[PDB]
Amino acid sequence: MQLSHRPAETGDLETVAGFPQDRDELFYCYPKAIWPFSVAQLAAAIAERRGSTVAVHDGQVLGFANFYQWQHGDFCALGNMMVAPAARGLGVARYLIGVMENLAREQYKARLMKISCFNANAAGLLLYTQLGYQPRAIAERHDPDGRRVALIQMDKPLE
Ligand SMILES: NC(=O)c1ccccc1C(=O)O
């Protein structure tokens, strides 16, 4: 695994929009989106967010993330974390989170990163825990079927 990163580009959109594999996966990384995901929905998110970044290995875009909140001197909130199915479990999310932490520090002078994770996403909860994120609160959300879910709000200091 030899990873690099760069800002997302329009030519990346179809690849990245292909990463969520079902309605649940889309919900866990973009709960406002509607299944099926699309390039137009992804581009609309990018336009209203900051710091949209891809991770690349062996000439392939394998991961994407951005910030859905950003407050200079204060914090950023990581969003839209998506990884190519074949590249799951291989450190791509871990790598991108590190890159986004540096970007929050550098671009926003952030002292904290916030990550919100839906309760069903065990893999995310475990990874964010390995990376030093701590749970702070639990908020109620509703999934696309109107079922109540729990959004675990985590954070981590950035010095
Ligand atoms: N902004 C959110 O409500 C959210 C919550 C959990 C995971 C991802 C996101 C996201 O849209 O990026």
Automatic annotation (TrEMBL):
Residue ranges annotated for the N-acetyltransferase domain, each copy included: 13-159
Positions of acetyl-CoA binding: M81, V83, G89, G91, A93, R94, N121, L126
Acyltransferase found in the keyword field: yes
Origin: domain of life: Bacteria
Binding site for Zn(2+) 1: H5
Binding residues annotated for Zn(2+) 3, in chain numbering: E140, H142
The UniProt record lists the keyword Zinc: yes
Pfam family of the protein (one): Acetyltransf_1
Binding residues for CoA: C29, M81, V83, G89, G91, A93, R94, N121, Q130
Signal peptide as annotated in the record: none
Keywords: Acyltransferase, Metal-binding, Transferase, Zinc
Gene Ontology terms for molecular function: metal ion binding; N-acetyltransferase activity
Binding sites annotated in the UniProt record for Zn(2+) 2: H57
InterPro entries xref list: Acyl_CoA_acyltransferase, Bact_Acetyltransf, GNAT_dom
Protein name: N-acetyltransferase domain-containing protein
Organism: Pseudomonas aeruginosa (strain ATCC 15692 / DSM 22644 / CIP 104116 / JCM 14847 / LMG 12228 / 1C / PRS 101 / PAO1)
